[PDB]
Amino acid sequence: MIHELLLALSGYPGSIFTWNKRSGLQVSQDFPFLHPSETSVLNRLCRLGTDYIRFTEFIEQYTLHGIYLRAFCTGLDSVLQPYRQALLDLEQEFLGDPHLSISHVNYFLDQFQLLFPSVMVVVEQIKSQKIHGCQILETVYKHSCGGLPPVRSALEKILAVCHGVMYKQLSAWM
């Protein structure tokens, strides 16, 4: 079930973890083998999976057009890299000792659980207001002055690569 979950958190839904187009990832119903109290923490854990799926679906779709949208998604995968890498690790720890429960797996995500939520509305403002052109370099900047240290250190990376486009065009013109 562990390796079953670590795929559900990767973007592959199955029988245990059904997928709904509106709500998001969620557990189907009660399971006899597992306890009836875990049916909650998983639902708390899926609130993270829904973010990665809705992320990568948008990343692939590229949707609106413009280089500054292409580069934003190009950078959006970079901040999302430590999420994947930290997920590959969970399997290694479970491969060693077979006494680790979902509690430890839920504990390992820790930082990703408090980061995705704040970096979810930044995407929603784009797809809901048709933010076309260089105006992205402000809509992302107005959210770069956030208090959360992890976020203040995430969006700054995206702004650091999104400026690479302007810096490309600006030098090409001047």
Does 170 help bind other proteins (rule: CB under 8 A)? no
Contacts of 53 (CB under 8 A, 6+ apart): 11, 19, 24, 25
108 class by beta-carbon count within 10 Å (0-12 exposed, 13-18 middle, 19+ buried): middle
**Is 158 in contact with 173 (CB distance < 8 Å)?**
no
d(CA 67, CA 78): 17
Sole binder of other proteins in the list 95, 120, 160, 170 (CB under 8 A): 95
Sole binder of other proteins in the list 64, 120, 148, 170 (CB under 8 A): 148
Question: Which residue blocks in 18-66 are alpha helix, DSSP H?
Answer: 38-61
**Is 87 in contact with 46 (CB distance < 8 Å)?**
no
Q: Which is nearer to other proteins, 3 or 163 (CB)?
A: 3
Does 8 help bind other proteins (rule: CB under 8 A)? yes
The span of 34-42, 50-58, 125-133, 154-162 binding other proteins (CB under 8 A) equals: 34-42
Residues at the site binding other proteins, with contacts judged by CB under 8 A: 1, 3-4, 6-8, 10, 12-16, 35-37, 39-41, 44, 84, 87-88, 91-92, 95, 99-101, 103-104, 106-107, 110, 114, 117-118, 142, 145-150, 172
